[PDB]
Design a protein around this motif. Structure first.
Motif, PDB file in Angstrom:
ATOM      1  N   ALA A  19       0.814  -1.138   0.091  1.00 47.17           N
ATOM      2  CA  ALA A  19      -0.077   0.120   0.025  1.00 47.17           C
ATOM      3  C   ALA A  19       0.855   0.989   0.183  1.00 47.17           C
ATOM      4  N   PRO A  26      -5.818   5.772  -0.725  1.00 46.24           N
ATOM      5  CA  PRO A  26      -4.464   4.636  -0.668  1.00 46.24           C
ATOM      6  C   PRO A  26      -4.523   3.957  -2.169  1.00 46.24           C
ATOM      7  N   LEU A  28      -3.076   0.083  -3.868  1.00 45.96           N
ATOM      8  CA  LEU A  28      -2.717  -1.096  -3.504  1.00 45.96           C
ATOM      9  C   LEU A  28      -2.444  -2.078  -4.630  1.00 45.96           C
ATOM     10  N   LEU A  65       3.324   0.575   3.432  1.00 47.73           N
ATOM     11  CA  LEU A  65       3.107  -0.733   4.127  1.00 47.73           C
ATOM     12  C   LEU A  65       3.001  -2.150   3.209  1.00 47.73           C
ATOM     13  N   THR A  67       1.820  -6.381   3.565  1.00 45.33           N
ATOM     14  CA  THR A  67       1.215  -7.451   4.412  1.00 45.33           C
ATOM     15  C   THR A  67       1.423  -8.631   3.526  1.00 45.33           C
ATOM     16  N   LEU A  84       2.434  -7.467   9.257  1.00 44.43           N
ATOM     17  CA  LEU A  84       2.291  -5.812   8.560  1.00 44.43           C
ATOM     18  C   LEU A  84       3.733  -5.275   8.882  1.00 44.43           C
TER      19      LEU A  84
ATOM     20  N   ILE B  18      -6.978  -5.428   2.689  1.00 44.31           N
ATOM     21  CA  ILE B  18      -7.853  -4.111   2.782  1.00 44.31           C
ATOM     22  C   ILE B  18      -7.089  -2.871   3.309  1.00 44.31           C
ATOM     23  N   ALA B  19      -7.040  -2.062   2.324  1.00 43.76           N
ATOM     24  CA  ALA B  19      -6.353  -0.629   2.560  1.00 43.76           C
ATOM     25  C   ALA B  19      -7.473   0.597   2.681  1.00 43.76           C
ATOM     26  N   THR B  20      -7.087   1.347   3.666  1.00 43.54           N
ATOM     27  CA  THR B  20      -8.130   2.412   4.297  1.00 43.54           C
ATOM     28  C   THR B  20      -7.004   3.708   3.885  1.00 43.54           C
ATOM     29  N   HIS B  27      -3.862   2.834   5.550  1.00 43.58           N
ATOM     30  CA  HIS B  27      -3.624   1.696   6.560  1.00 43.58           C
ATOM     31  C   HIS B  27      -3.873   0.279   5.929  1.00 43.58           C
ATOM     32  N   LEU B  28      -3.506  -0.749   6.229  1.00 38.91           N
ATOM     33  CA  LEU B  28      -3.591  -2.009   5.439  1.00 38.91           C
ATOM     34  C   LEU B  28      -3.501  -3.125   6.635  1.00 38.91           C
ATOM     35  N   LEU B  65      -9.763  -0.254  -0.636  1.00 39.24           N
ATOM     36  CA  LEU B  65      -9.444  -1.145  -1.830  1.00 39.24           C
ATOM     37  C   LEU B  65      -9.119  -2.567  -1.277  1.00 39.24           C
ATOM     38  N   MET B  66      -9.462  -3.549  -1.924  1.00 45.44           N
ATOM     39  CA  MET B  66      -9.043  -4.888  -1.425  1.00 45.44           C
ATOM     40  C   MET B  66      -8.385  -5.654  -2.533  1.00 45.44           C
TER      41      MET B  66
END
Ligand SMILES: Cc1cc2nc3c(=O)[nH]c(=O)nc-3n(C[C@H](O)[C@H](O)[C@H](O)COP(=O)(O)O)c2cc1C
Ligand SMILES: Cc1cc2nc3c(=O)[nH]c(=O)nc-3n(C[C@H](O)[C@H](O)[C@H](O)COP(=O)(O)O)c2cc1C
Lengths: 122, 122
Positions: A19, A26, A28, A65, A67, A84, B18-20, B27-28, B65-66
């Motif tokens: 991300a 964001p 991704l 970031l 994952t 993370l 999942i990104a926010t 954030h992820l 985003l996913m």
């Protein structure tokens, strides 16, 4: 800094997610567990074929970031675990960091993430 | 609008990301492929145990985003494929959307993503 459990995840296949900060929210993107190379100095290298929007985002803010995980590695409370990763990204087109992923002949570059923290989150 | 290849991916395990939008960067967070529940009306439902930072981010901006995938499903780059999903998110704590994941007794909420677009990115 990266723990043994992380390297165990890397022994298994899976979808890695990266991300970045985009202009309207964001962004991704992905790679595969098996495509990652880990270097001394807490560095994770990704082979870059696309990632053009990702690269533009990194130029405005290098903090990223990541994952990744595997259901086949035991977590704290049940089957599976993952991480993370927070770190700083840079793109390389030559040098040893590029040579890490140069077997991927479609790679126009290497994305190198210098890890600041890795958190086992499951 | 979720395509057939996406459901093929969900027959296989993996890490969902999942990104926010955070206050100062993305954030992820994650779930498992096997935890997702897809409902009609383009809804993807995620069992929420934690995701408190994610929830606060969804409050600031509902767009998320996913990504998810599987090496076991064929893509356009040999073995393996995956998706970038964009949608609007909401946290449900009552109602049929919550009931769809309520067998997870550790769930405090359902994260409901209403999909706007699904792109097969590998
Ligand atoms: C499971 C998976 C693996 C991927 N692996 C790679 C990869 O190793 N390198 C890459 O450049 N793109 C890879 N992609 C495509 C990227 O996620 C992305 O869609 C593409 O690079 C475009 O990036 P951009 O949106 O930043 O322009 C992968 C996609 C999926 C679903
Ligand atoms: C592979 C994997 C799957 C996870 N599954 C879930 C899950 O289904 N629900 C959940 O709330 N957290 C899950 N987590 C933990 C979240 O990713 C996240 O760390 C936690 O919910 C805290 O969210 P926050 O950082 O938004 O507060 C999982 C983590 C991993 C590595």
């Amino acid at each position: 800094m990266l723990p043994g459990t992380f390297f165990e995840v890397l022994k298994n296949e899976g979808v890695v997610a990266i991300a970045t900060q985009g202009e309207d929210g964001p962004h991704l993107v992905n790679t595969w567990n098996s495509y990652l190379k880990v270097l001394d100095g807490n560095r994770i290298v990704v082979p870059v074929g696309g990632m053009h929007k990702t690269e533009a985002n990194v130029a405005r803010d290098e903090r990223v970031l990541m994952t990744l995980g595997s259901r086949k590695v035991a977590g704290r409370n049940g089957p599976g675990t993952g991480f993370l990763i927070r770190g700083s990204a840079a793109f390389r087109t030559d040098g040893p960091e590029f040579e890490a992923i140069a077997r991927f002949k479609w790679a126009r570059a290497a994305l190198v993430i210098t890890v600041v923290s890795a958190e086992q989150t499951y």
